[PDB]
């Protein structure tokens, strides 16, 4: 069974990276909610 989470770190941190979440206006709100909440692992 080719299960649904096949991890590959380059394919991860270029979708969900810090810079890849810094490539729109809507990318900043994703970090902005993530800052005003109080989360520790800010990006992925």
Partner RNA sequence: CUACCCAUGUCCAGGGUGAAGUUCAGGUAACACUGAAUGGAGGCCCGAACCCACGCACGUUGAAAAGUGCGGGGAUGAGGU
Partner RNA sequence: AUGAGUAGCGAAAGAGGGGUGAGAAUCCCCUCCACCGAAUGCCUAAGGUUUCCUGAGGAAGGCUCGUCCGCUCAGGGUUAGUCGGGACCUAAGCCGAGGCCGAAAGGCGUAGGCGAUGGACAACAGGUUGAUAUUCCUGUACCACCUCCUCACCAUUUGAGCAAUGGGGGGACGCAGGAGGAUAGGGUAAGCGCGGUAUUGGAUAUCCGCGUCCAAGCAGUUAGGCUGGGAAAUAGGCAAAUCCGUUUCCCAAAGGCUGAGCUGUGAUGGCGAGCGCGAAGUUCCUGAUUCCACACUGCCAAGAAAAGCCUCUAGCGAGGUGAGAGGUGCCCGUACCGCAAACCGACACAGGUAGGCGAGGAGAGAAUCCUAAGGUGAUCGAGAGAACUCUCGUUAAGGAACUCGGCAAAAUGACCCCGUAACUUCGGGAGAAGGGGUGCUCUGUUAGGGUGCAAGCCCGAGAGAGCCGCAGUGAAUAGGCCCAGGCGACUGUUUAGCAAAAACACAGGUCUCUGCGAAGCCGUAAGGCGAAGUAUAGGGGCUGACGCCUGCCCGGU
Under the criterion CB under 7 A, does residue 38 sit at the interface with RNA?
no
Instruction: For the CB of residue 29, give the shortest distance to RNA in the complex, in Å.
Output: 11
Q: Which residue has the tokens 């890849």?
A: 20
Instruction: For the CB of residue 42, give the shortest distance to RNA in the complex, in Å.
Output: 18
CA distance 38 to 32: 10
Please give the C-alpha separations between residue 32 and each of 6, 18, 23, 36, 44, in angstroms, as whole numbers: 29, 12, 14, 6, 14
Interface mask toward RNA for 5-24; x: CB under 7 A: xxxxxx------------xx
Instruction: Note the residues at the interface with RNA (CB under 7 A).
Output: 1-10, 23-25
């Amino acid at each position: 069974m080719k299960r649904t989470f096949q991890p590959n770190n380059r394919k991860r941190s270029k979708v969900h990276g810090f810079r890849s979440r810094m490539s729109s206006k809507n990318g900043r709100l994703v970090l902005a909610r993530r800052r005003r909440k109080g989360r520790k692992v800010l990006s992925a």
